[PDB]
From a paper:
Allantoinase (ALLase; EC 3.5.2.5) possesses a binuclear metal center in which two metal ions are bridged by a posttranslationally carbamylated lysine. This ALLase-catalyzed reaction is a key process in the biosynthesis and degradation of ureide required for the utilization of nitrogen in purine-derived compounds. ALLase is a member of the cyclic amidohydrolase family, which also includes dihydroorotase (DHOase), dihydropyrimidinase (DHPase), hydantoinase (HYDase), and imidase.
Four monomers of EcALLase-BL21 per asymmetric unit were present. The global architecture of EcALLase-BL21 revealed a TIM-barrel structure that consisted of 17 α-helices, 20 β-sheets, and 2 Zn ions. The active site of EcALLase-BL21 containing H59, H61, Kcx146, H186, H242, and D315, which were required for the metal binding, was similar to that of EcALLase-K12 and other members of the cyclic amidohydrolase family, such as Pseudomonas aeruginosa DHPase (PaDHPase) and the dihydroorotase domain of human CAD protein (huDHOase). The EcALLase-K12 structure had been solved, but three segments, including the two active site loops, namely aa 64–68 and 150–161, in the ternary structure, were undetermined. In this study, these two active site loops of EcALLase-BL21 were fully solved structurally. Based on our structure, the bottleneck size of the active site pocket of EcALLase-BL21 was approximately 3 Å. Correspondingly, these residues in EcALLase-BL21 are E64 (loop I), G66 (loop I), F148 (loop II), T151 (loop II), and F161 (loop II). Accordingly, these amino acid residues on the dynamic loops may be also critical and can be modulated by rational design for the substrate specificity of EcALLase-BL21.
Residue numbers in the entry:
A (entry chain D): 2 to 150, 158 to 453
B (entry chain B): 2 to 150, 156 to 453
C (entry chain A): 2 to 453
D (entry chain C): 2 to 150, 155 to 453
Write the structure that this text describes.
């Protein structure tokens, strides 16, 4: 007897989308097909798309220490409402930063009973743990995040990057990198402030494309020489993507990601919205956006992730140059991209499924996640196409109910989210069950 | 309920191989998973690999005119015994060559009741049909084959202008062009030269078709196809240098795919010398270092499909020395088991990569919506492969019309135990061929 | 003491153009500098540019057999009046074609005393002499010219014939072994021929129709094919008259990868475009076609970027009867030998600001260096005293009567040209003077590779 | 009448080497050819190669302030003895460093009467003068040197990525090239410390602590930042064919970049370095013979624009200690021409006119020295006479440096400098030493 059968949905499979039923047993996808028979429970997905749960490879929760920025409780409720069933949690903003076993075990205690979704873990590669990267590897982190160019996050200089990447290469861990030449970016920003240039266009001119390209080029070469697998975080320009593409076409093991706000917003809209649209690699002009869409449709951008980066509203007050950078968008990755990629620009459903879930799970070794296939976790989002709503602040489950998407007309709706076989979010019910999420550790799956 | 359930096999799915049951209804995959329930018939696939049936994108049958070379009866039985469930049939050797509605309708009639497997069809782009390419597009070929620079109904090569113009037309119709890429002039003149010198060993024959003759032809057709706006498929690539040309072009955005054949991964010029004219084929079997590079390209994902280029001929055309003998490998029956042994068992290729190379990639390139993958709603086309189970291939084993092959005498480390086409066992290692031939032609606009 | 001193000119040296005097003795440059002393004769070059005389690496004279198209007598007079002092003569359209020792010796005999300029020689690599290429290498040709047709076109016995891919590869291999460069007319002839037939069939016979029937990709395909075959055969390659920047880009990429390849173009691809072709008629029809203005702008950037090694005439005259008919029926070829130096000086240097030493390399030094003409192409001590004096900012309207070709037609007639050839000096003697005409008997000689 | 005629030498002209005479008047080349006539003085170059004087684009003299490392007096005598007639002086080691008008004018005062050769000038692009680059441009430096990455005030200091980008952007505006020492200094330092920690301090350990990839990374970074800034770039002393290849790739894409190397990277290898000790230690390190084979191929392929000394002397006390502790730098100013003539022309078959370009003409053209680098009418009469197939063993006593040490001491060198001529006067002669008071002059960009 199956625990559950989802019937009549347009199911996103590896190869195509088609109307098929999904049988579920013990939290796992037990069968896919027709005439699957009887089950304790039956769901009608007629007229909906059944996607694999989003796998968000770039999520800041920052609980231990900076929990008042978001925290697990609100952060993962918003994730589930946004159709995210697995997040890959960054090591930073949390204090202590997640850099060794004690720091990650501290966070593990902090999270007990608060996980509404499943969560794999990224370790930090920082200046003060190059000697102890094996610790988080043993615990089962799925990658290490660093920034280049006392329990808080710190960047690494060129030598600390090369040495840490060398070690990570030996351990089988990928390095993830925020690629901006921050020295040049800081100094251009100071220059703009001195001159009283603090518009959105001024801020973007202060983080020009070449500062992304230089940093991607440096990181690519050092990671190659170190023998380390590489993932380039939130690429903001098609020029940055081309660097990654050129490297892979020469045989380098490198992947990259972007975020919905580089496909759906632009500098002119960033000006109108204000500091809620400020983020570190900046939202560039519309011609840049067009390039990014072409890269995405060309297959050069492996994953779409949130870079959910909230902060208390006092840090968003004031002019754009002094404000804290970060987009609160975790809840609107799936519906906004389905509307903008699938409905408006004609992207195929299985390509959507790859960009929002499968690729990330394959890159980070999440064996049970990312695909509607026999034996994987029964993690789904039901999406209602051609069903619009205007997003408002009290739709948001964030701790701080703000987002540069508030007031946007969004052409599709998350109607339901299912994690390992149980409905964790329902547009008609809210959150019907106690937090059932679990951490995912590499050697424990 | 379900007509059939295949249980306990290691199934090659798109993403991974795993032990799951397959339910079948009406020639179609009805479900995949566990506890699928009741069925009229149940197969036990324990200890076997259940692969999508091979989609062989490059098969010569040659039935009207040159049926005595192979023909539909023997050729498709060999294919089903080799674990191939869909062939994509070349338009040459048959007479009339398959170049317009009349010639293909002729063939259709000749083949009635003889198809043991399913067959998509290739048109020929030749010198005398440039203006009627739309005819075979209407019938529903999935591509057009040509050879780039006799009998009025035979196959003919096209010069550079006929290629460009034909490809320009095909690009408008949404049809790929498939090309045998060698500079035939240089290969012919080097061959005569070797003949005149009395240099007629296998090594001489390969030296008379050097790598640069394949690279030049590939570079020429890549550029002409690009300027013509036509999707291109480069047939049987024999060198990694040829593969590199295709890779470089795709990396620049050109819509091009390529294929190779088991004899370029499993045989080399030294074994070719030992075997003789049965190992002679047109793009030649090259040396062992070439082979090693070939394996590296395959494991790197630069070769889209593995195909047979099954090319038998009456034995008298294999008599004589290597330079004068007819070129062609009779290998239709041993693509799947040889390749499973050499790629999966001996070199560690993953089951999903093997499934993509032998079936899924070819199905996706030629638009065979129902074939090539174990997925819900696709045709229930499978091969059961028994790993780590060896046999010595003999002529008696061969279902070809001419029971010869350069693989005879080889120890092959895996066995094809069963072949299922649209839900029915068409070949079984123990029962032989249990059902009347049930194969159908596959036409592009009718699925 | 010196035979001659040329004083006060702006002399084009390899590195720069400066006012220096030139001393000549025994037909050779004996010294360069100031206060050179006494000489049997003095010329004033004030206000003039003193350039190396042009080295035209692509001239059709066709004398033995098709002399009535041009021939040595008129052809080299026109060359001298155009400021050319060395030509590198093609093996066609002469009959017999220059393909072996017997054919070139017949030609040497016919040319005796008719050379107004010096002439290095190119052999033909043709379908029927691949086994005899050593003969012309021994004689001393400086290179071998061929047309590559995948099939091999129609032709006359003893005439220039195209080579198929095999013949090109085998010949190129032998040329690589002899140390001889292969020169190639790079156009896919079949595709151009068939598209031309298409146009005629459709009633489309304008100049724009002709250019569309020889599209850029037919040039690029042929260059790519020849680049690769010559590479494999191990042969130095020169790509003749490139008509498009896409063709230049193929040559550049090959060189950047280390291939030994050079290329050239012609003044008509820099100074005419298809719109002027349409107004001019068949006199501006040529095989690699004159393309549109956007193409011309790209050619100018290639040239200024150093990607085109040499400028040559491709002087391709024919009897005017062969210029009758519509553009698709007429014989291709530009009669332009007389107006390479002054048109290009005007268009490159005056109008577009090219440096005088770059002008000198493009018109003379690079060709001399590529084909190993040790005595030619540069104003340097010990080289031949070969010069042309050019008067800048001095214009004239070209008339038929100015032309010294056998057939006094050219697409440049009626053109306003902003500089003038005032004097041409060959091995220390005035052979052409704007005021005197041709003052001495023809003194030109053949230049042979091993007898320099 | 001419002041002088040099007769019967094999003269390296731009296009070829051939026997011709050179007439000189007023310190300039008046004529080249035969039968030039009478002169006040005649020299017999029979049997010698008459080359343009070397143009050394990378010289450290360090006079105002660190004169005791070398100084103009001994430095320029050694240059002249080695056949160098123009040096392009680096802004570093001297104190104050050459970074603005006051520091260079201070330098001009120290040099008076000490210049045996001519000296064009490089400025420093340093952390603290980015807003004042126009001053040295006005004075007439021919480029600006920097180190992209800690020092003395008024000393030479590194620039960070931002200072390099902003400075390069200004320099592109002024029409000045930027010259860069290209090593990832952080990674070299840290690997070097590692070596010491582990007790690994041989020459082979030092080279492995400055791996090729630290050169390639730094060149790639600078290539890309100079491009974005719009600045012409010169890459200093490349040590590896991998670094050259980065430069060649960028040029082939249209970037205006040039590079140089030094004799020690063609003529020494790490195994010799080990036997020599710290006198052969240099910042871009002398690599293994297989690397050296690659460098010779790059050189013969035209991928390296000039050869320069990177003369980097120091008091011998700084050469004490093991290889990891000693000060890096090669004292080799005196043995650039004769060693490269031997190794390149006599041993490896390089053409004389290519030698001329690599040792002189390219440097003069890159840095806009209109009067220098080539034997041609109207240029300065700067020559060196080289005697081929004439060998000698270098001794400490041969050296004119302040500190008479060099990693070439005791080496066999198969050609000899016999005469150096500067603007028409013999300033060095193997038969008479230095027969005229110092007559060198500074060369300023806007005053040639
Ligand atoms: Zn970030
Ligand atoms: Zn982030
Ligand atoms: Zn074939
Ligand atoms: Zn075939
Ligand atoms: Zn031509
Ligand atoms: Zn011609
Ligand atoms: Zn340095
Ligand atoms: Zn230095």
């Amino acid at each position: 007897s199956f625990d559950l059968i989802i019937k009549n949905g347009t199911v996103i499979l590896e190869n195509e989308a088609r109307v098929v039923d999904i049988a579920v047993k013990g939290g796992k996808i037990a069968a896919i097909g027709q005439d699957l028979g009887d089950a304790k429970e039956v769901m009608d997905a007629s007229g909906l798309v059944v996607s694999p749960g989003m796998v968000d490879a770039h999520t800041h929760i920052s609980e231990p220490g900076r929990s008042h920025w978001e925290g697990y409780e609100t952060g993962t409720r918003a994730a589930a409402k946004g159709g995210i069933t697995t997040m890959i949690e960054m090591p930073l903003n949390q204090l202590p930063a997640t850099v060794d076993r004690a720091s990650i075990e501290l966070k593990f205690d902090a999270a007990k009973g608060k996980l509404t979704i499943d969560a794999a873990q990224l370790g930090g590669l920082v200046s003060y743990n190059i000697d102890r990267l094996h610790e988080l590897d043993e615990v089962g982190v799925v990658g290490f995040k660093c920034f280049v160019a006392d329990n808080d996050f710190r960047d690494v200089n060129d030598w600390q990057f090369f040495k840490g990447a060398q070690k990570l290469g030996e351990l089988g861990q990928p390095v993830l990198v925020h690629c901006e030449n921050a020295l040049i970016c800081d100094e251009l920003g100071e220059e703009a402030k001195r001159e009283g240039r603090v518009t959105a266009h001024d801020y973007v001119a202060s983080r020009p494309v070449f500062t992304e390209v230089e940093a991607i080029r440096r990181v690519l070469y050092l990671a190659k020489v170190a023998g380390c697998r590489l993932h380039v975080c939130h690429v903001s320009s098609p020029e940055g993507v081309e660097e990654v593409t050129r490297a892979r076409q020469e045989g380098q093991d490198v992947t990259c990601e972007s975020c919905p706000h580089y496909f759906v917003l632009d500098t002119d809209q960033f000006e109108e919205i204000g500091t809620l649209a400020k983020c570190s690699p900046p939202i560039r002009d519309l011609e840049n956006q067009k390039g990014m869409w072409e890269k995405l449709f060309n297959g050069e951008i492996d994953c779409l992730v949130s870079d959910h980066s909230p902060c208390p509203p006092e840090m968003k007050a004031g002019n754009i140059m002094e404000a804290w950078g970060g987009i609160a968008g975790l809840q609107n990755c799936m519906d906004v991209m389905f509307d903008e990629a699938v409905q408006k620009r004609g992207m195929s459903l299985p390509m959507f499924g790859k960009l929002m879930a499968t690729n990330a799970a394959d890159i980070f070794g999440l064996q049970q996640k990312g695909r509607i296939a026999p034996g994987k976790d029964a993690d789904f989002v039901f999406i209602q196409p051609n069903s619009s709503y205007v997003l408002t602040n009290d739709d948001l489950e964030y701790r701080h109910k703000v987002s540069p998407y508030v007031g946007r007309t969004i052409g599709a709706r998350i109607t339901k989210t299912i994690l390992r076989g149980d409905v964790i979010y329902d547009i008609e019910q809210g959150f019907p069950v106690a937090p059932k999420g679990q951490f995912i550790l590499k050697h424990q799956q």
